[PDB]
Write a protein that binds this DNA or RNA. Structure first.
Ligand SMILES: [Zn+2]
Ligand SMILES: [Zn+2]
Ligand SMILES: [Zn+2]
Ligand SMILES: [Zn+2]
Ligand SMILES: [Zn+2]
Ligand SMILES: [Zn+2]
Ligand SMILES: [Zn+2]
Ligand SMILES: [Zn+2]
Ligand SMILES: [Zn+2]
Ligand SMILES: [Zn+2]
Ligand SMILES: [Zn+2]
Ligand SMILES: [Zn+2]
Lengths: 51, 46, 51, 47
DNA sequence: ATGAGCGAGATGGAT
DNA sequence: ATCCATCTCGCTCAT
């Protein structure tokens, strides 16, 4: 299985209220968390709580 | 089959020659249509 | 009035291409200007020169 | 002068106060426009 | 009159 | 720093 694709959202100045919570974030889009990512001001709600 | 109303109500070059004309869109002529200043390139069949 | 604008007309996959840069939504055509410096595709702007 | 239709999908703080409003972009007021929730600061002079 | 569909522009993750 | 796929949202025009 390919390595978990890390994101870099919000690094640059963009709208900080949606960083990693829209379809441009590959993690958010794939229902993953940003564990291990290099995003800044991450607003990803996903926890990978697969239970 | 459609009878369009293009040009009745501006880009005069595209009248019945763009996706919003139901006849152009469907590869049809404007035979029987109510269009004004029709530019449909598909002529009524002789 | 500012220096003439730059457009990006025609980048979408539209088949409505007869009037690319030759209708009111092109800021160049609308202002009686050429597409000098633009990144439009399939440009039909009839203006060869600015102003 | 143009007649814009801004405000008639989201973000109303900036309607007619951003580069996509032909009036704001050209330093014109929205007097006579069809815009709605207009935030254009430019005011039309007195005739 | 009017609103669906259009399409040029803004955005910002990736580079 | 720009680039371009994706999204926004002002504009046109058949209805
Ligand atoms: Zn992200
Ligand atoms: Zn991430
Ligand atoms: Zn994140
Ligand atoms: Zn027609
Ligand atoms: Zn027709
Ligand atoms: Zn016709
Ligand atoms: Zn153009
Ligand atoms: Zn141009
Ligand atoms: Zn052009
Ligand atoms: Zn406006
Ligand atoms: Zn206005
Ligand atoms: Zn306004």
């Amino acid at each position: 299985s390919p390595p978990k694709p890390k994101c870099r959202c919000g690094i640059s100045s963009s709208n900080t209220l949606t960083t990693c919570r829209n379809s441009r974030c590959p993690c958010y889009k794939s229902y993953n968390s940003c564990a291990g990512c290099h995003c800044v001001g991450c607003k990803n709600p996903h926890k990978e709580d697969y239970v």
